[PDB]
């Protein structure tokens with residue numbers, strides 16, 4: 124609400140700085156992500172404080188991982204498309220920059236499927252599936268801290284019946300030829316996980332494969348590379364779909380490819 128923020132802060136800021144105040148922000152649970160121009164640095168705390176008041180949030184992080192500008196408690200529960208996502212906003216990446224994809228996941232699975240989430244996080248991609256798809260889900264998350272939330276989110280959504288969780292590196296995962304669908308929501312050279320994926324996959328399984336490719340190499344990549352690694356195993360793969368996502372600089376998109384693999 125500009126007027127109120129303006130009314131309060133104009134009382135302490137040069138009108139010149141006033142004009143520069145944040146016009147937008149991101150909100151996650153009761154935590155605010157707030158972007159700030161350089162020339163406002165001296166006043167950052169007071170600014171975050173009044174925005175906290177009028178926007179009704181407990182804590183403010185700098186949007187620009189994140190600097191604490193006001194408050195202390197960065198844990199919160201964020202509700203999206205009917206799903207409760209508990210997280211620690213400061214320590215765990217989560218962005219409505221990717222809400223479309225989480226919505227999509229709500230519309231892909233059939234209740235029979237076994238799905239394996241190789242980079243579960245707090246359940247970003249898997250929860251939508253366990254709730255709307257009604258399919259079974261095994262979810263793997265390496266970080267013990269992240270893992271706590273993943274677990275908690277399973278209860279918060281009343282799916283503990285059809286969704287399990289392991290705090291381990293996906294590489295050490297025992298299952299093989301068990302997955303009808305695989306989630307690979309990771310972006311740091313995800314291609315190094317293709318082999319384990321192919322191992323976990325059943326013949327014909329669908330894989331949601333995320334990664335970050337320079338647009339220079341598009342649309343050859345990232346598929347070519349996926350294709351060739353798969354060849355190393357005598358398996359074949361068909362590209363069903365390629366969506367672009369949080370395309371981000373410099374010069375590299377974040378894409379997701381929907382692929383089917385054939386174990387011959």
Ligand SMILES: CSC[C@H]1O[C@@H](n2cnc3c(N)ncnc32)[C@H](O)[C@@H]1O
Pocket residue numbers: 216241242243244245247263264265266269291292293294308309
């Ligand atoms: C939240 S999006 C990416 C997620 O995958 C997790 N992750 C990264 N590498 C692995 C791995 N090798 N096995 C299981 N989870 C992983 C991260 O800790 C994070 O929560």
